Amino acid sequence: MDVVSLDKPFMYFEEIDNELDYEPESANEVAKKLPYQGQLKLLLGELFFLSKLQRHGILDGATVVYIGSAPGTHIRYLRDHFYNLGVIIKWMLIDGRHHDPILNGLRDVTLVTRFVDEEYLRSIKKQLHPSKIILISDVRSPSTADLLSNYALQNVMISILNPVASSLKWRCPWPDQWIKDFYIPHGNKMLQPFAPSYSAEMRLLSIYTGENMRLTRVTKSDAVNYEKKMYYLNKIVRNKVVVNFDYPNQEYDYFHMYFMLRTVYCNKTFPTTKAKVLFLQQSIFRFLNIP
């Protein structure tokens, strides 16, 4: 077995302290070990993000605009969690595909069947005015060109929507498929527990202060670093059994998940953090119908 003692998990990309040459053969390796794992990946990252905002006092009274939201099953859980916490939030979920009917019939959530474009983004901005907007994006078209096209759209989402915070899908194009250097919003590169086995995808979390929009350039050399850093993490780190982690499941992803969940706010008072996390994970797995 691959056992080890770890103080804490890598929470952000910059924390990954090692790299490995990418082995293309790893693409034939099982990408998922859990059923509904995708929805789980999304629920943890999104719960983490919004909890951070709650912590900063900028969630209550906001309208969360989720683009690329369908089916969005896990969103129902997120909605219930803050709704039960007494937090006032309106959800506007936009996608051209149909949403899970469990999201239907809640006066606090509006489902929209539309593929967004710069034009539509301007109409929704005019219609949401003057509520504060929190943007979440999970759109997916992928070729490098598809990616650049998506990232280009996420930047327009922010310039037009002008949100107080944003969570964007972020995956650097592969270096051997480089096209042109580009810019992405500045934010923390939140690592995702339960992401596919060899995914290099992460979530870029940002809080906007003032009227400034800071961006950062990304070049092929960064793409090379992204590849090796994410390959070492997937191949090595995520395959670790944290023996000093006293929990029903000691695999890295559960260790990483514990750290995200311990930041979530509950109505129920617990004696320890282990008790709250166990509670949250239990609730989460039950909702997703995960064993």
Ligand SMILES: Nc1ncnc2c1ncn2[C@@H]1O[C@H](CSCC[C@H](N)C(=O)O)[C@@H](O)[C@H]1O
């Ligand atoms: N311009 C656009 N506007 C809205 N949705 C878009 C889009 N381009 C791609 N998408 C959507 O991005 C989605 C990618 S899958 C997203 C899964 C979703 N976040 C959930 O939690 O299940 C697709 O449903 C797709 O229709």
